[PDB]
Amino acid sequence: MSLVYMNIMMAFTVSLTGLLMYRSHLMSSLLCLEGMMLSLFILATLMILNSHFTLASMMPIILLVFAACEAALGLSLLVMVSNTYGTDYVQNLNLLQC
Amino acid sequence: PFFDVQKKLGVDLDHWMTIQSAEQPHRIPARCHAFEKEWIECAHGIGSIRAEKECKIEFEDFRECLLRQKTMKRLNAIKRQRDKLIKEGKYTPPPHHSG
Amino acid sequence: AKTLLHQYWDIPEGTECHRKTYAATSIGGASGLVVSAYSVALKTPTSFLEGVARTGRYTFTAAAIGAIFGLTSCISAQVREKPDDPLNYLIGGCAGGLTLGARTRSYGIGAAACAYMGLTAALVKMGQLEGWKVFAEPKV
Amino acid sequence: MFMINVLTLIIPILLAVAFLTLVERKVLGYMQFRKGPNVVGPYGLLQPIADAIKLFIKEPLRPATSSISMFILAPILALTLALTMWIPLPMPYPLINMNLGVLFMLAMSSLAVYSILWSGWASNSKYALIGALRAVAQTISYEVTLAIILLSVLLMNGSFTLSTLIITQEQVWLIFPAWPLAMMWFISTLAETNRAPFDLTAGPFALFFMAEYANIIMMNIFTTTLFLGAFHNPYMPELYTINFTIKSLLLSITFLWIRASYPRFRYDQLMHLLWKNFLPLTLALCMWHVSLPILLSSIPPQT
Amino acid sequence: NVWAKEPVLVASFAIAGLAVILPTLSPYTKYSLMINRATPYNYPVPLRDDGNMPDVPSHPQDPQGPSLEWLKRL
Amino acid sequence: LLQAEKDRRVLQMLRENLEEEATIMKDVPGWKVGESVFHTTRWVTPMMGELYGLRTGEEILSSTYGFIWYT
Amino acid sequence: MNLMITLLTNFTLATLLVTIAFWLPQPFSMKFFLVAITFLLFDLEIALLLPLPWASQTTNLNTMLTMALLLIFLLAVSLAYEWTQKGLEW
Amino acid sequence: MMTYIVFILSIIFVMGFVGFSSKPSPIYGGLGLIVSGGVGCGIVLNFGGSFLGLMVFLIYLGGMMVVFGYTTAMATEQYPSNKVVLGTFITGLLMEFLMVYYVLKDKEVEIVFKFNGMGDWVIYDTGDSGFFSEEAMGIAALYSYGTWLVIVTGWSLLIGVVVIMEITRGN
Amino acid sequence: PGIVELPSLEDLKVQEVKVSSSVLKAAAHHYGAQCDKPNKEFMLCRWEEKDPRRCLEEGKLVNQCALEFFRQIKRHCAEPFTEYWTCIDYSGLQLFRRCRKEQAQFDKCVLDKLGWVRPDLGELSKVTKVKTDRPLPENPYHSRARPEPNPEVEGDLKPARHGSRLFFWTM
Amino acid sequence: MNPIILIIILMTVMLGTIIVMISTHWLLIWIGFEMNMLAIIPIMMKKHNPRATEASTKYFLTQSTASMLLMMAIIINLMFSGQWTVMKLFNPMASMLMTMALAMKLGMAPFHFWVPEVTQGIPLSSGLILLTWQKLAPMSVLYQILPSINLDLILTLSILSITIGGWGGLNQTQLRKIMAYSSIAHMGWMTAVLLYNPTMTLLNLIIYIIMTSTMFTLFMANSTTTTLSLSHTWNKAPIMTILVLITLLSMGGLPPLSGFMPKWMIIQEMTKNDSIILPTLMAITALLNLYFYMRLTYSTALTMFPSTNNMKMKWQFPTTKRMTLLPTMTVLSTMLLPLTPILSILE
């Protein structure tokens, strides 16, 4: 089953719980999103290497560049929120009540 | 909905990133090439339901080529048995490099 | 979960009793933990002792309703000796609603809970008696 | 024997950096009208020995820190980059033959950007933070340019092994098929080493100093491998090592010589100049060095 | 004109346009594609002998098969 | 020539390793001595634990992981 | 693990240098942020460009030339867009 | 220093993900993601890994965490550890210790799977005639076969540029 | 299920050509000239059946052909063949442009004294016929039959039977 | 904002959604969802109030984590039997993660917490385009990968989304929250019949998109946030009132009107199976979500609230808004009752 895949899936659950529960700063949430991205990258890359899946070996780098520009958009949104406020807490966002 | 301009224009621009055994830029195979060719030829002119209930044997052969689960289970059982019998001490092992 | 609801419905009803009440208390504890988990997620109790108190209250009330439902289920099935009616579980749902109103300490809620829980319990046993599948055929 | 190889690489780096300090002081002294340092012994090699051991002796900066571990963790990273960045550099036989080394070069340059940013955050109050923030900006704005140019100059040679580079430099120097690209690359090396004519106006100052000068000698050695040099007949590596050392020394003297006589740039002039003049010109040279090997029937033997 | 206005941009457009055009007038692109095609990566796989075909030569010295001769002669 | 030596060497490890297995597993019930887990009557390429199995570390580390971090 | 041995020796000798150097003597702007994101996006486009010298030996050369010129052309369009549209001004 | 070095570097990898999923200050988070990316590079280079794992290193440890630490430096302050952060770090270390203990002294650990528990020298190549490091020629496609993919990728990055300038005050 | 059919240790004893690598690399082209004519039997066996443990007689044949070729080059000129491959040995990876004058010397030896013109480029290419004695195999992918065909729906279509046949809106 | 830039952003929304429609590779579907997000972010924050900024922040966080969980499901699919063909999947766990990803992508009951908050602080055009294309884009994917889904997933999310869009919905006079809860209820309907006959799902998608376009076009004809502003629209113009009447009643789904046709065909090809109690529960909740429509109609066109002068001033100016296409969409959306055998126009 290529035992390391279990550890990288457990690492995915680590990064996903770190993405979901997050106390104060949005930057930690965005960085754990980046960690989740790295987890998918590594897991799929080891799979494609051991498969000799040599034709469509584009998945690691292209998944990487797309979700990297996603993280760029997240950085710009966090800069905009921190620009119109003092800080970038999860609090001071309780306006616009559901 | 899923559309078919991919087939309609005659430009098969996206069917090459798709499976293995499409022609790599240097003509090399993957690790489970022939299993794929027989599985695709098993389930080609098929309505994807007798693919579920008829090509099961060759699909399991392809899956155990791809992951090698139970073959590693057999090898791991051999390793654990070898460890417990060398723990016992019978036939201080000539399976390594010599008699 | 499917395993413990299957353990509840696998009992002939019928009398194989007090396993029915144990399974019904397990159902009540599970459902109380579900709804209390949503409530402690969506309230921020502050302090945490209040959160444990609210979860304990929800689990305790749902387990009590399950226990009383199973008790009068077993008693009505033994006494009437007619295991096919839904009227015994109509009595069951009304008893569960009355004790829900008892543990929330208001009586109109207990009356409406008697009516609605009795109707739903009669419908549940009635649909199990005829046979109405869970959520799907899913064929045509 | 392999740890002996590693120690014979990373023992002469202290000798090289301290003697580079005396050489830059003497060469600035003779670009100016100054002799010395020559009172401290004959011509002053014990003068870098003496001030190095003096700065070791002299009492450190009192903290005044935030996360002591982080504050020690930044310069340890800078110096271990400066040590771990001479591994794949071929003078004739490199320490590790790799499939690819130039992307490792650019990656460790980005780790130097990490060193600057971590020292800037963990340093002090807000003004030094703003200064180091501008420094990180003017450092990071050039790794676009240097990686682009390095890609376009290896595209004439197709492979990343860099021993294929020392093969393909045998006939002509690579300065002749790409002079403007190499010139802009050299300006980018002046940017990455963060010296004059580019502005930067700590602890430990000796370690940051060490990382600076090992970065300079690193870029000079990589330049001398990359754009010029000569052949290497085997079973005689002293010949290529002599010619390599002489050309790298002349280029480092030229580097400090260009430093010696130019004022520092304005910051918005620096960003303006980089983007609006190097970036379209790098793109022009890249597209022409793409479309030209498909023209002139010379695509490299990428094995 | 604009040669005095923004000169490095005009030089970039000029070298850009010649890089676009210049592969059209080129007597070497077919040479490039022949060089790039005539280099084998995999094994040159044989075949079941003959239907008595005047191709697929038996000795590798035999020049009946398609070979390269413009390689050695520049 | 390299191909022929490679084929003879991997069949040599197959023969000796199944001889070792036939010597070592005569206690467990069941256990046909040389079954492929697969169903088709085809020579599958082995999995480097059928070849380099129970060789105790040294040769399998110098064989599998050799090129991966050899320089 | 051979370069891991080199990394270990350099790391240990650097820590020896630091610890023997230490045991012995005893708001913000948007303009700061635009350049970093511009770096990030053009660096990702560099990441798309840089396998070009890997690719130049195939049997499809005109198409490679066309899409390589398309990648640098798109990068130039992005550059000229933020150039003309006051993206980097002061 | 032995066979299960891929497994051990995976242990340090999941420790790093726990080490910034405990929610520290985000510059400690950037440190944790840098350490995690370095050891992930180590894992994929152990599978070899000749290009892609050195390729991620320039992007995430070369271009992404730089801007994450940049935005940590310029936007949030966090001017002064805590119970909750280090307690979650303790429970994450406990969960990893429990899972790897049950991998070590038993057959297999199942979340809902069958992870065949031993270190992975299996599977691997049986010494084939590679000759071009198949990653290299694979990624040395995308310009012959890759018509659509690189076009939509570059187009998405261009639209990312115009999106960023519009939200940060286009034009 | 099915067990493999391994060959014995009686077929796994060929006089192996235990020679080193640089001499075998430098002695490649004329080995392609004189010998390597009956090993495309082995190549066609390997590519018509993907199954070594079967084509091993032709492996023994190419083994004895290469040993016979090195015997024939051992007995006659050149003994400075030894000088040629030790001139090409210590040059890293063995470029053939390294020791070119002694390559000309070995070619002049073998040409003026034995024959064996060197194969010009590109004559170690150029797809080559081969006849064998065994008949070519069928279906080496040992599989079952293609289980069911779909009955292809054809025939000229009738109009609608009494309209939509829904609730209403008939016709 | 430049008009060229807005035409470009609309081009990229259309490009991303068409890539989701047309591709057969999984990476391309993920690229289409991400590009749809990246393009739809600056349609919001069209003004520069902080309401749209916080709305776009919440939307970006939920949309990005949905995208990455979708990528997790695909990499699980290739951890099992691995090929990049949009077909039957090869794991109940991967299909579970994938349908929960798409349930985050488009408005579902555990995941609906961002929908009224993203719609409240934005203008009407951004809300219209996000509802249309962000409820059109996952439906093609679900229509593709239906034959390998555990049914309890889809049916649980459908039932709970219909009853949440019902019960949540009796409390808001913010018209964007009303339309958002209506979107939740109708997306529960349009997801419910995915595993039985997806022709009904796509026809319901067409009808819902045309209805919401009519409703938001009527709100863009005269800028309102509350019902009292709709009473002022009663005072200033009478034809908008009867349009609000007809379009609210066709959101209500009454058998003389065309909004009933998607309910009725769902009940038909649902009850040709053994599902009867589930249709009567769903249609009781369809009776439930008509009540806020009905009190809205009572507020707009049937009773009349007291008005303010300067409506006297607004009498002297005839109407000068441009409608994109209001009347064609209106009579396509409401008089479509005798065209039920235009069911089979779809498959």
UniProtKB/Swiss-Prot annotation, chain D:
Its main location: mitochondrion. The chain crosses the membrane at residues 2-22, 68-88, 100-120, 147-167, 172-192, 202-222, 238-258, 279-299. One of its GO terms (biological process) is mitochondrial respiratory chain complex I assembly. The keyword Transmembrane applies. Core subunit of the mitochondrial membrane respiratory chain NADH dehydrogenase (Complex I) that is believed to belong to the minimal assembly required for catalysis. Complex I functions in the transfer of electrons from NADH to the respiratory chain. The immediate electron acceptor for the enzyme is believed to be ubiquinone. It comes from the Eukaryota. GO terms for molecular function: NADH dehydrogenase (ubiquinone) activity. Its EC number is 7.1.1.2. This is NADH-ubiquinone oxidoreductase chain 1. InterPro entries: NADH_UbQ_OxRdtase_su1/FPO, NADH_UbQ_OxRdtase_su1_CS. HAMAP family: NDH1_NuoH. It catalyses: a ubiquinone + NADH + 5 H(+)(in) = a ubiquinol + NAD(+) + 4 H(+)(out). It comes from Ovis aries. PANTHER family: NADH DEHYDROGENASE SUBUNIT 1, NADH-UBIQUINONE OXIDOREDUCTASE CHAIN 1. Keywords: Electron transport, Membrane, Mitochondrion, Mitochondrion inner membrane, NAD, Respiratory chain, Translocase, Transmembrane, Transmembrane helix, Transport, Ubiquinone. One of its GO terms (cellular component) is mitochondrial inner membrane. Belongs to the complex I subunit 1 family. It is a multi-pass membrane protein. It is found in: Mitochondrion inner membrane.
From Swiss-Prot, chain G:
It is a multi-pass membrane protein. The chain crosses the membrane at residues 3-23, 32-52, 61-81. One of its GO terms (cellular component) is mitochondrial inner membrane. It is found in: Mitochondrion inner membrane. This is NADH-ubiquinone oxidoreductase chain 3. It holds the Pfam family Oxidored_q4. Core subunit of the mitochondrial membrane respiratory chain NADH dehydrogenase (Complex I) which catalyzes electron transfer from NADH through the respiratory chain, using ubiquinone as an electron acceptor. Essential for the catalytic activity of complex I. Belongs to the complex I subunit 3 family. The gene is MT-ND3. GO terms for molecular function: NADH dehydrogenase (ubiquinone) activity. InterPro entries: NADH_UbQ/plastoQ_OxRdtase_su3, NDAH_ubi_oxred_su3_sf. Its main location: mitochondrion. Keywords: Electron transport, Membrane, Mitochondrion, Mitochondrion inner membrane, NAD, Respiratory chain, Translocase, Transmembrane, Transmembrane helix, Transport, Ubiquinone. Its EC number is 7.1.1.2. GO terms for biological process: mitochondrial electron transport, NADH to ubiquinone. It comes from the Eukaryota. It catalyses: a ubiquinone + NADH + 5 H(+)(in) = a ubiquinol + NAD(+) + 4 H(+)(out). The keyword Phosphoprotein does not apply. Core subunit of respiratory chain NADH dehydrogenase (Complex I) which is composed of 45 different subunits. Interacts with TMEM186. Interacts with TMEM242.
Curated annotation (Swiss-Prot), chain H:
The gene is MT-ND6. The keyword Mitochondrion applies. Keywords: Electron transport, Membrane, Mitochondrion, Mitochondrion inner membrane, NAD, Respiratory chain, Translocase, Transmembrane, Transmembrane helix, Transport, Ubiquinone. Gene3D superfamilies: NADH-ubiquinone/plastoquinone oxidoreductase chain 6, subunit NuoJ (1.20.120.1200). It comes from Ovis aries (Sheep). This is NADH-ubiquinone oxidoreductase chain 6. It comes from the Eukaryota. Belongs to the complex I subunit 6 family. The chain crosses the membrane at residues 1-21, 25-45, 47-67, 84-104, 145-165. GO terms for cellular component: mitochondrial inner membrane; respiratory chain complex I. InterPro entries: ComplexI_Subunit6 (IPR050269), NADH_UbQ/plastoQ_OxRdtase_su6 (IPR001457), Nuo/plastoQ_OxRdtase_6_NuoJ (IPR042106). Core subunit of the mitochondrial membrane respiratory chain NADH dehydrogenase (Complex I) which catalyzes electron transfer from NADH through the respiratory chain, using ubiquinone as an electron acceptor. Essential for the catalytic activity and assembly of complex I. Its EC number is 7.1.1.2. The keyword Lyase does not apply. It is found in: Mitochondrion inner membrane. It is a multi-pass membrane protein. It catalyses: a ubiquinone + NADH + 5 H(+)(in) = a ubiquinol + NAD(+) + 4 H(+)(out). GO terms for biological process: mitochondrial electron transport, NADH to ubiquinone; mitochondrial respiratory chain complex I assembly. The lineage of its organism: Eukaryota, Metazoa, Chordata, Craniata, Vertebrata.
From Swiss-Prot, chain J:
GO terms for molecular function: NADH dehydrogenase (ubiquinone) activity. One of its GO terms (biological process) is reactive oxygen species metabolic process. The chain crosses the membrane at residues 3-23, 25-45, 67-87, 96-116, 122-142, 145-165, 178-198, 200-220, 237-257, 274-294, 325-345. Keywords: Electron transport, Membrane, Mitochondrion, Mitochondrion inner membrane, NAD, Respiratory chain, Translocase, Transmembrane, Transmembrane helix, Transport, Ubiquinone. GO terms for cellular component: mitochondrial inner membrane; respiratory chain complex I. It is a multi-pass membrane protein. It is found in: Mitochondrion inner membrane. Its EC number is 7.1.1.2. Core subunit of respiratory chain NADH dehydrogenase (Complex I) which is composed of 45 different subunits. Interacts with TMEM242. Core subunit of the mitochondrial membrane respiratory chain NADH dehydrogenase (Complex I) which catalyzes electron transfer from NADH through the respiratory chain, using ubiquinone as an electron acceptor. Essential for the catalytic activity and assembly of complex I. This is NADH-ubiquinone oxidoreductase chain 2.
